[PDB]
Paper text:
Cyclic GMP-AMP (cGAMP) synthase (cGAS) is essential for the host defense against cytosolic double-stranded (ds)DNA arising from various maladies (e.g., pathogen invasion, ionizing irradiation, and genotoxic chemicals). Upon directly binding to and dimerizing on dsDNA, cGAS cyclizes ATP and GTP into 2′−5′/3′−5′-linked cGAMP, a unique metazoan second messenger for initiating type-I interferon (IFN-I)-mediated inflammatory responses. cGAS is central to antitumor immunity, host defense against an array of pathogens, and regulating autoimmunity. Here, we resolve these numerous fundamental mechanistic questions in innate immunology and present a unifying catalytic mechanism of cGAS. Finally, we reveal how mouse cGAS achieves more stringent substrate selectivity and higher catalytic efficiency than the human enzyme. Together, we set forth a unifying catalytic mechanism of cGAS in which dsDNA-binding pre-organizes the active site into a rigid yet adaptable lock for two sets of keys (substrates and intermediate) necessary to specifically synthesize 2′−5/3′−5′-cGAMP.
Author numbering: 144 to 240, 246 to 506
Write the structure that this text describes.
Amino acid sequence: GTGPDKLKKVLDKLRLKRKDISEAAETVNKVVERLLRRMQKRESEFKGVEQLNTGSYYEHVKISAPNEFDVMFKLEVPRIELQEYYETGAFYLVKFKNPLSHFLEGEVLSATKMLSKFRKIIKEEVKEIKDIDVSVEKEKPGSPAVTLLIRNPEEISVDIILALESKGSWPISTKEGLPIQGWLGTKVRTNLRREPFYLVPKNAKDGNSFQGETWRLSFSHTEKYILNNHGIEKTCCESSGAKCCRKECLKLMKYLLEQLKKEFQELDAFCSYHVKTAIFHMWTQDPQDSQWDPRNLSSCFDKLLAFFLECLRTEKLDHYFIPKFNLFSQELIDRKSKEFLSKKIEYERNNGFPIFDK
Ligand SMILES: Nc1ncnc2c1ncn2[C@@H]1O[C@H](COP(=O)(O)OP(=O)(O)OP(=O)(O)O)[C@@H](O)[C@H]1O
Ligand SMILES: [Zn+2]
């Protein structure tokens, strides 16, 4: 009945959704493993592909849509030379200091050519999977994912994202990113930044020339590590430690946005990565595990909402790893969309969150 009890009931509702998601993920993993084995046996530019087990499912914060999954296939590419396309770090061109020589447009790696060959090979090899009902969805223009359609008998879509892996040092645009020093610490930050980084094809949608061939940085591996190692204490949420409500707040906020986006197409510009980025900042601002005690679920959720509303008001939400990349810039999301979302969030906040019941 009370506000705090109603919020705990929403988490119970999300917990019940996880059984169907876990069962679908088992079917997805069977297909994905089968396909990866085929691509690893075939001789091609992609023989080295491996699954990167990242994203919301592997972070344990996939809260809905058991019929939709994303998987990332990483491919190590030695001797990558990056060129900033946007000097904020939002987009890069890939050049080389070559196994990928067939995909070059001049000196620039063509995502279009590379993805075309990736898709062609996936389609050939998926046709050889005989004991699962799986096909490749017809290509959609503007969608770089290669989408598998699995029938189990119900349809599950799996977006396969090709990611390049670079073992070089992280780009200079990330120099002041990952501001975890007061929370996870400087040794953790040093260790995380020695890991590879990833490049994911994404069209910049602007004054062209090399529109089509741009890539965005991806730190999905780092983000998974943070989600699963999120406490100032090493034992946070372990069997010999204390539970916190950090992930619960993320799930509630993701669900709030999902429910709002379902009702209002004015909110198309917003996505769950905005919520994830916001909570990364909130975990940096409030680093103590005691600031995320389970008994403070309601007040922690409310401070996350307040922080998100302030990001909307100031049209500023910096990418956690790329500080000059403003996800809420006027250029990327118009002012009226932010004011619309601010109005909806404030309504939910002051009226007991009726949209959770939808
Ligand atoms: N709009 C986006 N902008 C930047 N990165 C994004 C965006 N959407 C997804 N990502 C990338 O994907 C990861 C976060 O997405 P996630 O794994 O939660 O998938 P999802 O399909 O959005 O999840 P969910 O179904 O839980 O909402 C990060 O590695 C992030 O870099
Ligand atoms: Zn915890």
